Amino acid sequence: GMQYEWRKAELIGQLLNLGVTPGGVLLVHSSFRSVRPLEDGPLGLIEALRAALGPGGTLVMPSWSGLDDEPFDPATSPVTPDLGVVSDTFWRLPNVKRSAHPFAFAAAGPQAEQIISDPLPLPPHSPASPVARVHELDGQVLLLGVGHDANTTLALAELMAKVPYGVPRHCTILQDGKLVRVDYLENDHCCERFALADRWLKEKSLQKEGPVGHAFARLIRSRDIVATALGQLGRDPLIFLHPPEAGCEECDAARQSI
Ligand SMILES: CN[C@@H]1[C@@H](O[C@H]2O[C@H](CO)[C@@H](N)[C@H](O)[C@H]2O)O[C@H]2C[C@@H](N)[C@@H](O[C@H]3[C@H](O)[C@@H](O)[C@H](N)C[C@@H]3N)O[C@@H]2[C@@H]1O
Ligand SMILES: [Zn+2]
């Protein structure tokens, strides 16, 4: 309609009033469809995110390609479309370091290469993943117009709880001039039941909520996400799986994989 185009200074306040603190590590997942309109477009969001964190802060965003038969290059490989414009734009700006593997992240800040310097992580969200370095650095996770279905650290908690299901997934890189398929076993599914973490985090007062632009925003500490999901996965490791009653083809495949 005739909606308010948020300026940079107000976005900073919105970020500060949400819990974003300067000097920290902030991993954000965004759906710009819910943020818009902004006065400066998707760049205006990125500019505010780094303006609130300050120079001593480090902004981290997903930056993987999502393609399994195409090799990855941090200089050209576009972000998968499901990650949004903000993700696809952030890694192209000056001084934004990027991982050199298909499941790459993008980071900018004094701790950037502390986060993205690992080689190909198998599984994609293992320890020694960018998402695990955010955990190790006590970073924050900012859900930006997206639910916990996009919360990547939730998958890190799965492997940290030694979850039984492992489904065969693959990617490809360039080894000495030629392709090669790299087969691994990932712990993915529909990820719909990741929304269960909303009640888990909220009941423990671990999740900050509020507006960032027009989007609904969820801010949770990375270590608080892992810890919360650990205790819940320690109660039932299959709690993120759809029951066979629901007839979810994705989860039923993970279930059959012990
Ligand atoms: C094509 N690569 C992948 C595909 O694997 C494929 O495997 C077979 C061959 O390889 C194909 N025949 C089959 O069509 C397809 O299933 O499975 C899906 C599973 C879905 N949860 C999501 O994963 C998530 C990732 O697992 C997660 O690491 C990341 N955060 C983002 C994605 N949402 O996107 C991937 C991606 O689309
Ligand atoms: Zn499912």
Author numbering: 0 to 257
Quote the study that presented this structure, word for word.
AG resistance is primarily conferred by three classes of aminoglycoside-modifying enzymes (AMEs): phosphotransferases (APHs), nucleotidylyltransferases (ANTs), and acetyltransferases (AACs). AMEs permanently alter the AG substrate, preventing them from binding to their target, the A-site of the 16S rRNA in the bacterial ribosome. The fold typical of the Antibiotic_NAT family is evident in all structures, composed of 13 α-helices and 8 β-strands, and determined structures superpose with pairwise RMSD’s 0.8–1.0 Å between 197 to 266 matching Cα atoms.
To increase the chances of capturing substrate-bound enzyme complex we used the catalytically impaired His154Ala mutant of AAC(3)-IVa. Using this strategy, we were able to determine the crystal structures of AAC(3)-IVa enzyme in complex with gentamicin or apramycin to 2.6 and 2.8 Å, respectively. In both complex structures, the electron density corresponding to the AG molecule localized to the cleft between the major and minor subdomains of the enzyme. For the AG substrate in both structures, the 3-N group is positioned close to residue 154 and proximal to the presumed location of the thiol of CoA. In the complex structures, the gentamicin molecule spans across the enzyme’s minor subdomain while the apramycin molecule is twisted nearly 90° relative to gentamicin. This difference is reflected in the rotation of the 2-deoxystreptamine rings of each compound. The 2-deoxystreptamine/II ring of apramycin stacks against the sidechain of Trp63, and its rotation positioned the central and III rings more into the minor subdomain cleft and towards Asp67. Notably, these two residues are contributed from the much shorter hairpin connecting the α4 and α5 helices compared to the equivalent region in the other enzymes we crystallized. Additionally, Glu185 appears to be a critical residue for interactions with gentamicin and apramycin as it positions the 2-deoxystreptamine ring for modification through interactions with the 1-N of gentamicin or the 5-hydroxyl of apramycin. Finally, the C-terminal extension of AAC(3)-IVa corresponding to residues 236-257 contributes to the interactions with both gentamicin and apramycin via Glu249 side chain.
